[PDB]
């Protein structure tokens, strides 16, 4: 039989900065946010859910030294923790 489902659910968006503000990119090292996100997923995917990893990425941007940017999580409808279980 037919059943109703939420039209929008289980999403998370993570942007490189807050609204109105820039993000930084280096010609040979790439985007600061991307490099920071990769480092955090590599270290923390084993033990933290994605929302926690994203918070840790935001925390690493806290002390602004010349190229300020504050990554922001948006339109979050995850109802569960998303653990990546790398290796499984």
């Amino acid at each position: 039989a037919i059943k109703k489902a939420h039209i929008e659910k289980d999403f998370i968006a993570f942007c490189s900065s807050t609204p109105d503000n820039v993000s930084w990119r280096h010609p040979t090292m790439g985007s600061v946010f991307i490099g920071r996100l990769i480092e955090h997923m590599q270290e923390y995917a084993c033990s933290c859910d994605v929302e926690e990893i994203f918070r840790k990425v935001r925390f690493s941007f806290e002390q602004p030294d010349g190229r300020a940017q504050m990554p922001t999580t948006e339109r979050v409808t995850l109802t569960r923790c998303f653990y990546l279980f790398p290796g499984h």
Binding site: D10, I12, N21, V22, S23, S31, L37, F82
Partner: peptide, 21 residues
């Protein structure tokens, strides 16, 4: 096909022209 499955969206892009400070 992705009902009840986590969909993670990552965006690297300026969101304006301000330095954010």
């Amino acid at each position: 096909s992705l009902k009840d499955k986590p969909k993670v969206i990552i965006i690297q892009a300026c969101r304006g022209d301000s330095p954010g400070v």
